[PDB]
């Protein structure tokens, strides 16, 4: 099949509220865990050593680079958020959210919080292509010489 | 001001996803509590002894008279649902009986927030403030002059 341009490079999920753009490798990944212990997007970020993502325009929050309100840092492993009624402000843990400058990281239990990027249902991940941990590492290993 | 026709007859909020049409009284009411202990729409239904409502077209669900899939009952105090992304409305009895996990559309004397949104604090402070007594009286008068 001809999957949309924003489909998870691992498993094919393409619900725009469920996928995340990796700004560095320039591919899309979903926030479901499958048979790994973390989401496809997070697992990708750790192994390929990337950090900056962009959400999809048709997600609840639109096309949006996650970054610190204060300094513009784009490292998802350092960013977190603070409530403001249904408004949220993102901040580096340090220094920008420090005591001198109730905070929580955007990645908990190796996935993005579901209000930022929806976790696909177990049902919807069953319909997607099934991929094991072994196959992903292989593929990440493969993506370096031929990104295609 | 000349506020829209679907503005709450108690306090005036007019966000279409927040108001409910009383099919019997032919007036609109919001799903915020304001200065009372329940939502305006529910209190009106209890006080005027009404039961059939309609949602607004520009609310999440468009214009829709709430009723049971099975029997067509329109009494919102009896309607509820049981759960991915389709919803079926059912009387608790008999239509939701075992022989035929259920939860009513009215909980804590307001409509569920996914059905009719609760107006924000900001939004209720800006509206006409009205007391529980004032509502009680005003409902009492509406029999004499609905206008």
């Amino acid at each position: 099949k001809d999957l949309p341009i924003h489909a998870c490079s691992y498993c094919g999920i393409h619900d725009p509220a469920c996928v995340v753009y990796c700004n560095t490798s320039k591919k899309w990944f979903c926030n479901g865990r499958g048979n790994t212990s973390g989401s496809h997007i997070v697992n990708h970020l750790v192994r390929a050593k990337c950090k900056e993502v962009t959400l999809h325009k048709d997600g609840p929050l639109g096309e949006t680079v996650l970054e610190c309100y204060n300094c513009g840092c784009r490292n998802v492993f350092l960013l977190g958020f603070i409530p403001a009624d249904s408004v949220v402000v993102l901040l580096c843990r340090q220094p920008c959210a420090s005591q001198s400058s109730q905070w929580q990281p955007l990645i908990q239990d190796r996935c993005f919080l579901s209000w930022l990027v929806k976790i696909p249902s177990e049902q919807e991940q069953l319909r997607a292509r099934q991929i094991t941990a072994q196959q992903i590492n292989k593929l990440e290993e493969l993506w370096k010489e031929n990104p295609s | 001001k000349d506020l829209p026709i679907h503005a709450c007859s108690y306090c005036g909020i007019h966000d279409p996803a927040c108001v409910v049409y009383c099919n019997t009284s032919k007036k609109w009411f919001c799903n915020g509590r304001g200065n009372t202990s329940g939502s305006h729409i529910v209190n009106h239904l209890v006080r005027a002894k009404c039961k059939e409502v309609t949602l607004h077209k520009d609310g999440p669900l468009g214009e829709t008279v709430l009723e049971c899939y099975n029997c067509g009952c329109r009494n919102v105090f009896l309607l509820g649902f049981i759960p991915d992304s389709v919803v079926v409305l059912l009387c608790r009895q008999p239509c939701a009986s075992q022989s035929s996990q259920w939860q009513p559309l009215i909980q804590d004397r307001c409509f569920l927030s996914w059905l009719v949104k609760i107006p924000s604090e900001q939004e209720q402070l800006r509206a006409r403030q009205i007391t529980a007594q004032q509502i009680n009286k005003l409902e009492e008068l509406w029999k004499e002059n609905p206008s």
Binding site: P60, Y69, V87, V88, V89 | -
Partner: peptide, 8 residues
Amino acid sequence: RGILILPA
């Protein structure tokens, strides 16, 4: 840039 308006 750093502020997010969440769903309903």
